[PDB]
Amino acid sequence: TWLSDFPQAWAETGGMGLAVRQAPLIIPLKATSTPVSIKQYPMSQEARLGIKPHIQRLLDQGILVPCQSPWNTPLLPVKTNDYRPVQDLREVNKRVEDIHPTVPNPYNLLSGLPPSHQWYTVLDLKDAFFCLRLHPTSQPLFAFEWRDPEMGISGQLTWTRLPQGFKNSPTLFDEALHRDLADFRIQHPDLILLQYVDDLLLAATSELDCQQGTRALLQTLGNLGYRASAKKAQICQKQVKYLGYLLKEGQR
DNA sequence: ATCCGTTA
DNA sequence: TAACGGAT
């Protein structure tokens, strides 16, 4: 099957991703910005216990690292009844220099799909932002406090990869993946490839071209260090769901 | 928690 | 001006 032919391309079998061709990202601040340190709001034991295994997993993966930084933003526990960590980066966002929004809206993106190409493959990349390294100079920006009362733990952690909740993450990811897939596009001029951050659609004129193109796209993505969800993959179908649309009979 | 634009 | 929804 597809899962077995391309072990490196799937999140399920290829391990955590890392975009090896992309330089670690440097995040420019606005001209008058200085660090802001917001105290961590006290967290309930219930929330802390819920969040803990996620933090530990990220530490084990090297995605979080200990740090000491003049920046600090609060971690929010957000439920489901399962607490997960959500960093409030709003005050960091306000101090980071704006970039032009280059990600197309889905409506316009889909306008680039011709009736000629009606065989589809849809992939979503797992933990997309985390595949992009953050330059060490920019890591301190995103620090938060992690305390474990019953383990004498108290200090800051920060991200070594592009973080969730950062205003520029979707745009920077979209632009990075475009750079990495530029060659694939050149090597396969007959294929249509739509990118919406971590949501991809490959379209072909025939089931064959689609299966061949999909094989190529999977091999390329895996080689570049990205990882797609095998669970959710829609491979070589006449009908697929993409960006909240049902694509069928060239409609939508 | 906190913030901020939109409705009531 | 008080809710309310959705946001990080």
Side-chain angles (χ1 to χ4, degrees), chain A residues 1-79 81-252:
Chain A
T1 58
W2 295 91
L3 218 181
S4 48
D5 269 356
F6 301 97
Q8 186 181 231
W10 306 110
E12 281 84 358
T13 55
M16 172 68 220
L18 192 170
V20 297
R21 301 268 264 290
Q22 292 302 307
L25 294 169
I26 293 174
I27 307 298
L29 301 180
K30 289 175 175 175
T32 59
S33 294
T34 49
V36 50
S37 181
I38 303 172
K39 226 295 187 181
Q40 171 65 51
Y41 315 135
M43 194 177 295
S44 72
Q45 184 176 276
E46 185 189 343
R48 195 160 55 260
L49 288 177
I51 288 167
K52 182 172 171 186
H54 298 110
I55 300 302
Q56 186 62 242
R57 182 191 61 249
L58 294 161
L59 282 165
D60 291 346
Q61 294 172 139
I63 294 174
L64 287 176
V65 295
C67 76
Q68 274 194 305
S69 171
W71 299 84
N72 199 80
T73 43
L75 219 53
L76 311 167
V78 175
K79 300 209 290 280
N81 274 330
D82 203 58
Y83 274 110
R84 79 180 209 285
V86 173
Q87 192 173 4
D88 180 2
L89 284 175
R90 287 173 300 176
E91 290 301 315
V92 164
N93 286 336
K94 296 151 94 99
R95 289 163 173 81
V96 170
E97 181 80 353
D98 294 320
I99 65 183
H100 190 65
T102 57
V103 182
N105 56 64
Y107 190 93
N108 290 331
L109 184 62
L110 275 177
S111 77
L113 218 191
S116 42
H117 298 66
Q118 290 202 208
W119 290 88
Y120 310 116
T121 284
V122 169
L123 307 169
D124 67 284
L125 303 177
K126 183 73 152 44
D127 298 323
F129 297 169
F130 289 167
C131 294
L132 296 182
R133 295 168 290 174
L134 203 54
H135 189 104
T137 306
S138 293
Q139 291 178 15
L141 224 57
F142 302 104
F144 59 97
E145 177 171 343
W146 182 248
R147 47 225 258 195
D148 189 349
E150 295 70 34
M151 273 193 54
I153 304 296
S154 189
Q156 286 167 301
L157 301 183
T158 198
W159 305 90
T160 66
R161 310 284 179 101
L162 191 60
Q164 298 287 331
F166 171 46
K167 72 177 183 185
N168 290 342
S169 291
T171 301
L172 296 168
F173 182 86
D174 197 64
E175 293 177 355
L177 186 58
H178 270 291
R179 295 192 295 274
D180 277 346
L181 294 182
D183 183 67
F184 173 91
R185 294 180 178 276
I186 291 167
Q187 300 313 138
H188 307 261
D190 295 355
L191 301 175
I192 295 287
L193 174 65
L194 267 30
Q195 294 175 232
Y196 186 75
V197 193
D198 53 7
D199 295 307
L200 311 183
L201 179 155
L202 188 66
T205 303
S206 67
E207 174 165 42
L208 181 58
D209 272 21
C210 189
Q211 76 189 42
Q212 294 293 2
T214 301
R215 291 185 191 102
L217 180 59
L218 288 171
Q219 173 76 218
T220 300
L221 284 168
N223 285 342
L224 287 164
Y226 301 95
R227 303 291 186 256
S229 174
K231 174 72 171 295
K232 307 159 69 180
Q234 302 169 72
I235 301 174
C236 290
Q237 296 180 179
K238 294 254 51 186
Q239 166 186 308
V240 294
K241 306 159 186 57
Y242 184 63
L243 307 179
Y245 288 98
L246 180 63
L247 267 40
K248 169 183 170 182
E249 297 295 341
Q251 286 310 130
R252 266 173 166 208

